[PDB]
């Protein structure tokens, strides 16, 4: 049985090829003494041990700990002998050449996998949506990308990266809330606000009219139960926190808005394919889960595009797992047997084989 592993900035999504969902989803965190603990437990012992995120903005940045993430994945979460399963992993769009070789070397040298493959996260999400052509908006905990894809392959020259995503949004709810009079300013506190984020936040189709209703109506308000017990009334951040996605100034970021990068991404692509892109805008990643975000992108990019353009935002309910699900389908295909990088092939060519087998 092949394994599928989607490593994110915040969460690890891991499981078996063939399954319809990841059997294992856990925090991408390694804790080391104040020799280490992994994910669901490291937040536990977080009193004794310093915790760090080995992946930043979708890129692997601490190899030593990343090696810990994988070990835990195979051994504590998946409960497999890694040396007997072909393993599929995922990577960000534009992962540096050396990262891809380092990930392949580790898998064959320190984990002894019999076979291995690396695919681009966003392309997997496109596949999971039953499509070969379109532009993916992928927005997780640590990064947001716009990835245009044509007849199966990403168009690297037109990809947009934006370091504003999920955590950045938590920190702003978790700063705007206190403006109301609440706490929130601890490495256990945002942890509560991110839960508020996930439950209460939504994207408004019109900001102003949403404003003109928020500071003037105890209807656009919800009450939430902290763990302490004290009840708090979420307002009006509900619609303000994700607004940062469209207006990045709110976090003082200056960057273009996700609708804008989407337009821009498409304009870097051959004119003959722009229609297909506009009509196949696929959303992927935890930070696209906000109620109302598909209706807003819609409106926002048809404003930007020529009237004649047929716009369409595709937002599958399972899009938290689209990347993983895309990998689960790919590694299950009868035709995938020969796509794998074998240990044989690795022994012959070493880690640079990845750039030839794995576009």
């Amino acid at each position: 049985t092949a394994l599928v592993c989607d490593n994110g900035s915040g969460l690890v999504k891991a499981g078996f090829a063939g399954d319809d969902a990841p059997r294992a989803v856990f925090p991408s965190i390694v804790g080391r003494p104040r020799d280490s603990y992994v994910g669901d437990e490291a937040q536990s012992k977080r009193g004794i041990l310093t915790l760090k995120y080995p992946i930043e903005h979708g890129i692997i940045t601490n190899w030593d700990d990343m090696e810990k993430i994988w070990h835990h994945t195979f051994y504590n979460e998946l409960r497999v002998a890694p040396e007997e399963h072909p393993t599929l992993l995922t990577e960000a769009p534009l992962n540096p050449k050396a990262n891809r070789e380092k990930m392949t070397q580790i898998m064959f040298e320190t984990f002894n996998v019999p076979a291995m493959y690396v695919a681009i996260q966003a392309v997997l999400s496109l596949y999971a949506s039953g499509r070969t052509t379109g532009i993916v908006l992928d927005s997780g905990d640590g990064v947001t990308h716009n990835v245009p894809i044509y007849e199966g392959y990403a168009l690297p020259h037109a990809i947009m990266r934006l370091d504003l995503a999920g955590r950045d949004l938590t920190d702003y709810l978790m700063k705007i809330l206190t403006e109301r009079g609440y706490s929130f300013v601890t490495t256990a506190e945002r942890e509560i606000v991110r839960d508020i984020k996930e439950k209460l936040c939504y994207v408004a189709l019109d900001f102003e009219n949403e404003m003109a209703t928020a500071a003037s109506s105890s209807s656009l308000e919800k009450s939430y139960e902290l763990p302490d017990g004290q009840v708090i009334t979420i307002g009006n951040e509900r619609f303000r926190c994700p607004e940062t996605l469209f207006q990045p100034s709110f976090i003082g970021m200056e960057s273009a808005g996700i609708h804008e990068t989407t337009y821009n991404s498409i304009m870097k692509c051959d004119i003959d394919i722009r229609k297909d892109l506009y009509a196949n805008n696929v959303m992927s990643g935890g930070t696209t889960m906000y109620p109302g975000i598909a209706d807003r992108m819609q409106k926002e990019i048809t404003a930007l595009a020529p009237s004649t353009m047929k716009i369409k935002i595709i937002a599958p309910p399972e899009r938290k797992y689209s990347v993983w699900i895309g990998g689960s389908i790919l590694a299950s295909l009868s035709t995938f047997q020969q796509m794998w990088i074998t240990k044989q092939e690795y022994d012959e060519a070493g880690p640079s084989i990845v750039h030839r087998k794995c576009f």
């Binding site: 319809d20 596949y127 949506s129 039953g130 070969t132 199966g152 399972e318 389908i329 299950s332 035709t335």
Partner: protein, 125 residues
Amino acid sequence: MVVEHPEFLKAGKEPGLQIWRVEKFDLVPVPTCLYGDFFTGDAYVILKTVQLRNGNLQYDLHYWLGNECSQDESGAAAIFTVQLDDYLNGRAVQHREVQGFESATFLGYFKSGLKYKKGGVASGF
């Protein structure tokens, strides 16, 4: 790459119409008598090979998705379509065909009029 799938070896060798159905993550040939009848619960891959005057062949690949096919099937069909195209040296034009919204070109492939029928194979997940 370099698929060894028996169906791939047969794909696109002479002018005509070839139709496969996704079944449990595999590409399974459809009986020729049954061409044009599609299960709304399934996904299919269609290759139209046309004789070019220059002697080489023209390929159009269509992945057709029924209203009720499962995500593994539509996903597989899209992926199978990329692989077949690759296999054929990138010479194929790829087309996404959704039940009820198929291109005039695709519709024109079926002499007796294309037909939908309820049902299909179970999800390979």
